[PDB]
């Protein structure tokens, strides 16, 4: 739950404003409706309905300021922890071809401080290669390097 300042909470009302088109202080499936549709995204009832269920802590069918601010924040950390392990893959992927070779891990690992034989890097790879392509994708990465 929030600690945040008022500079923090105010960017939050502004936010909570673009959604609350009638200015009543809550957000409806129809107001969510309409926003998803500005931003070129034409959804269906279920999705909307599911998107609200989601944020609707207390189930009156609506979302007030506080339930939004929770989510908004929770999903704030997360957009960060995302990118966090995205910058990471970014150095590890020296060629940023998309996937990380074994030779690249070794380059890094030794670009930093440890000296592995190929064997020991390949052994690194395999453990983290789920699509068994021999390389390491954001996906396998992060399945790994977060967890491990």
Residues within the annotated binding site for Ca(2+)? 20, 22, 24, 26, 31, 56, 58, 60, 62, 67, 93, 95, 97, 104, 129, 131, 133, 135, 140
Residues numbered 37-96 forming contacts with Ca ion, rule: CB under 5 A? 56, 58, 60, 62, 93, 95
Q: Which is nearer to Ca ion, 60 or 81 (CB)?
A: 60
Cβ pair 45, 80 in contact under 8 A: no
| CA quadruple 1, 22, 43, 86: dihedral sign | negative
Q: Which region among 7-15, 43-51, 80-88, 132-140 touches Ca ion (by CB under 5 A)? A: 132-140
Cβ pair 49, 30 in contact under 8 A: no
Q: Which is nearer to Ca ion, 34 or 97 (CB)?
A: 97
Q: Name 52's Cβ contacts closer than 8 Å, sequence gap at least 6.
A: 27, 29, 32, 61, 62, 63
CB of 71 to Ca ion, least distance (A): 11
Maximum alpha-carbon separation in the chain:
64
Q: Which region among 43-51, 77-85, 108-116, 126-134 touches Ca ion (by CB under 5 A)? A: 126-134
Per-residue DSSP letter, 100: B
Cβ pair 147, 128 in contact under 8 A: no
Residues lying near Ca ion in the complex (CB under 5 A): 20, 22, 24, 56, 58, 60, 62, 93, 95, 97, 100, 129, 131, 133, 135, 137, 140
């Amino acid at each position: 739950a929030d600690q945040l300042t008022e500079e923090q909470i105010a960017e939050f009302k502004e936010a909570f404003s673009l959604f609350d088109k009638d200015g009543d202080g809550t957000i409806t499936t129809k107001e969510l409706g309409t926003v998803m549709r500005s931003l070129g995204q034409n959804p269906t009832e279920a999705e909307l309905q599911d998107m609200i269920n989601e944020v609707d802590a207390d189930g009156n069918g609506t979302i007030d300021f506080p339930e939004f601010l929770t989510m908004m924040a929770r999903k704030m950390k997360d957009t960060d922890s995302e990118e966090e392990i995205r910058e990471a893959f970014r150095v590890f992927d020296k060629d940023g071809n998309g996937f990380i070779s074994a030779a690249e891990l070794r380059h890094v690992m030794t670009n930093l401080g440890e000296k592995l034989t190929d064997e020991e890097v390949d052994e690194m790879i395999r453990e983290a290669d789920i699509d068994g392509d021999g390389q390491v994708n954001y996906e396998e990465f992060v399945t790994m390097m977060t967890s491990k």
